[PDB]
């Protein structure tokens, strides 16, 4: 019938972990026959499919591992250790600490508002700071047919450039080479993250 191999190490139940670190819970037990171990989160069955990242289970070592913890991992985790003769259990309470994110913050290139001659090169610069992963786009206001706006809220725009930043700080650039009359107009650096959107406008006249 099941028992803890070190019952004294089983007194501690509360764990706080900063986000993106790894948590391991153990319930080292013994019995004859050697018992089963299964894991519950908030009293329900707990499976890899219940978090993104999955779980790593290690029955011989009586362990549940969760890599890269996030706030949604907060809660109660119970091991149920069982053979035919009996049952024991242990519940851990996990807190996960993470800073709250903000909307992106943009900074324009000091030239922006510009003028240039036919055939010359123009470059717009946009510094994007974002504590949550941003989608960064350079856009251009177009005109489908006298539509410097659209039957809605909604200036018409096409997307010149797009990427997802891998870092909190990005220096994003738009290069307009060998400029023609065509290239004159209003340009936007836009940055969107989970929390929201920021943008700056840049003008060219050729």
């Amino acid at each position, epitope marked *: 019938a099941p028992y803890w191999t070190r019952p004294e190490r089983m007194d501690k139940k509360l764990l706080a972990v900063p*986000a993106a670190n790894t948590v*391991r819970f153990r319930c080292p037990a013994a019995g004859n026959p050697t018992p089963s171990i299964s894991w519950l989160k908030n009293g329900r069955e707990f499976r890899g499919e219940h978090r993104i990242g999955g779980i790593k289970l*290690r029955h011989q070592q009586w362990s549940l591992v969760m890599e890269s913890v996030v706030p949604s991992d907060r809660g109660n985790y119970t091991c149920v250790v069982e053979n035919k003769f009996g049952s024991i259990r242990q519940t851990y309470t996990l807190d996960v600490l993470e*800073r709250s994110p903000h909307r992106p913050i943009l900074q324009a290139g000091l030239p922006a508002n510009q003028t240039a001659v036919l055939g010359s090169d123009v470059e717009f610069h946009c510094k994007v700071y974002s504590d*949550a992963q941003p989608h960064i786009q350079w856009l251009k206001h177009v005109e489908v047919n006298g539509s410097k706006v659209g039957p809605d809220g909604t200036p018409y725009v096409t997307v010149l450039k797009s990427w997802i930043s891998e870092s909190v700080e990005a220096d994003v650039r738009l290069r307009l080479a060998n400029v023609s009359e065509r290239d004159g107009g209003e340009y936007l650096c836009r940055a969107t993250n989970f929390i929201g959107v920021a943008e700056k406008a840049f003008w060219l006249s050729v």
Partner: antibody
Amino acid sequence: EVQLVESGGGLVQPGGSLRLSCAASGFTFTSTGISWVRQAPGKGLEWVGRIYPTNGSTNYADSVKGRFTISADTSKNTAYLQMNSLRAEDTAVYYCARTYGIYDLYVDYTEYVMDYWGQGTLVTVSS
Amino acid sequence: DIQMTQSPSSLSASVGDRVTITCRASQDVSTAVAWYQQKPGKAPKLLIYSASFLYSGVPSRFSGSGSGTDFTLTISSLQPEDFATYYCQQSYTTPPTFGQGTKVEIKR
């Protein structure tokens, strides 16, 4: 995949100073740490120190204590190694590594894991 | 400090072979042992943490075992991309310390 890029390596005279930088990608810089480890030419790996988390406390190898300092700018996701009073034997490739901890109430330690390492920067100490 | 002693320092093997590398701690380090792969001119890459836990995305032919003072890394069936140097490391205490490396080279 976290990517790290080390910079600032080069030639410096014995007794001199050098600051390395380690720029990290990603959005979890503040809740994890950065370790520095070096590799002398043709040799093995030697841990230099750790800042954990990046807004937290530091630890150093005995061979480096009082001479090297680790810091970080959380607004830049950049960690630094300030190297003073350099010696010929500090000659090495210097790596920075993203470091996280394994938290576990059953044991009295937190295992630190260095999972993503930069490409390295070469520091040569010579006259 | 805690000293980690790796054996062998080198070995020659063929694609398909089972390879076993050992690492011995000078004192008990529980299971706080990691394994790294390094290729010439490149940074080390993490394979295994907590003695036996495979880092995500690492092939399952790699495995680790051990507790206390004796640890082993096994490659079940060696692949062309596996010829490299392998390092153990303990992080039971500070400072964390590395073994001296095992170079796995190609038999011909």
